[PDB]
Amino acid sequence: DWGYDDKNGPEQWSKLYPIANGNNQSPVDIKTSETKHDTSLKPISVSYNPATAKEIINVGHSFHVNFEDNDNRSVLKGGPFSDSYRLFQFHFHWGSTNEHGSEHTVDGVKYSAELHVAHWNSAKYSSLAEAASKADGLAVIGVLMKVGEANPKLQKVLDALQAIKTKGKRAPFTNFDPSTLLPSSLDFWTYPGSLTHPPLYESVTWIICKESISVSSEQLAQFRSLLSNVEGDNAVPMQHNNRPTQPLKGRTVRAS
Ligand SMILES: *CCS(=O)(=O)c1c(F)c(F)c(S(N)(=O)=O)c(F)c1NC1CCCCCCC1
Ligand SMILES: [Zn+2]
């Protein structure tokens, strides 16, 4: 029902999802002069099992890669967390132009796209569906993607998109460790926030990497060539899916 278009996009979401105007909404601009270093943060540790890669799915507004989440084979730990979070998905956001496709910004600087690697709290909760609405339920690593050289690490993913061109299509996507997509250093910022699209629950601990990764102009074009319509209907490109930044409302962004 909601989308990213003028009629149903971010500026309209608060009508059906009032929490859009809440105190812990994402994404945010990270003003580096205002970050606070927390001596209790530990380094991030990611430990993903490539055999957990399962399927790629076109969901109309975006696409994602899911990973088997029945057990703790693939986990994020460290950082601000006291226990491990289980990997379940990764996806991207992009924009209509290379100039602004990221959701998070840094000192007002907009990147071309953004990678999200999503996990849920399997220490405290027993399912993604339980964890999704809890303040401590989800942990998402964000990586800002700077347009420039083509990124070869994206290749398996981009090559798969031909199999999921229209809304609802899905295909097997196996033997893939998405830590291969992360930057070499996992220095990061963390703040309490939300899902960036409806239902916008304030359930996400964000881990935003200090270091960016690359993406080419033509790789971004491949994202925008996915279609938001169902097969047989007239082709409608998925041109953009990034939410604008939202007020900090007194939250602190912590620096590792
Ligand atoms: C196919 C991607 S998704 O499942 O629609 C999805 C998404 F596109 C996102 F942008 C987020 S975000 N930006 O806040 O990480 C996301 F979490 C997505 N997945 C969730 C699953 C977790 C709870 C269930 C309901 C909302 C979508
Ligand atoms: Zn996202």
Domains and their CATH numbers in the chain: 2-256 (3.10.200.10)
- Please answer whether residues 237 and 226 qualify as being in contact, where contact means their C-beta atoms are separated by less than 8 angstroms: yes
Query: What number of residues does the chain have?
Result: 256
Catalytic residue among 37, 61, 119, 240: 61
| DSSP helix/strand/coil, 119 | strand
The one-character DSSP state at 200 is: -
CA 50 – CA 214 distance, rounded (Å) = 22
- Answer whether 243 contacts ligand 1 (Cβ < 6 A): no
Ligand 1 pocket mutation, candidates 2, 4, 66, 116, criterion most atoms within 8 A of CB: 116
Q: How many CB atoms lie within 10 A of CB 63?
A: 23
Any idea what DSSP says for residue 232? T
- Half-sphere exposure of residue 156: CA atoms within 13 angstroms, side-chain side: 17
Distance separating alpha carbons of residues 252 and 17, to the nearest angstrom: 24
Extended beta strands in 68-126, E state: 75-78, 85-94, 105-106, 113-121
Phi, psi of 13 (to 5 degrees): -60, -30
Place of tokens 């994206």: 154
Given ligand 1 and candidates 89, 104, 169, 201, which is best to mutate, with the most ligand atoms within 8 Å of its CB? 89
How far CA 153 is from CA of 8, 97, 134, 180, 183, in Å, comes to: 34, 22, 33, 7, 11
| Catalytic site includes residue 61 | yes
The ligand placed nearest to the CA atom of residue 195 is 1
Is residue 102 within 8 Å of 75, Cβ to Cβ? no
Q: Experimental method used, please?
A: X-ray
Residue 196 marked ligand-binding: yes
| Ligand 1 nearest-atom number relative to CA 195 | 14
| DSSP reduced 3-state for 255 | strand
| Residue 39, number of CB atoms within 10 A of its CB | 4
Cβ-contact 107, 30 below 8 angstroms: yes
The Å distance, Cα 250 to ligand 1 centre, comes to 25
Helix %, strand %, coil % of the chain (to 5)? 15, 30, 55
Quick check: 86 and 120 in contact, CB under 8 A? yes
Ligand with the closest atom to the CA of 226:
1
Strands 63-67 and 53-58: antiparallel
Beta carbons of 79 and 42 less than 8 angstroms apart: yes
On whether 100 is known to bind a ligand per the annotation, the reply is no
* Phi (first) and psi of residue 173, to 5 degrees: -145, 105
The reply, when asked if residue 61 is annotated as ligand binding, is yes
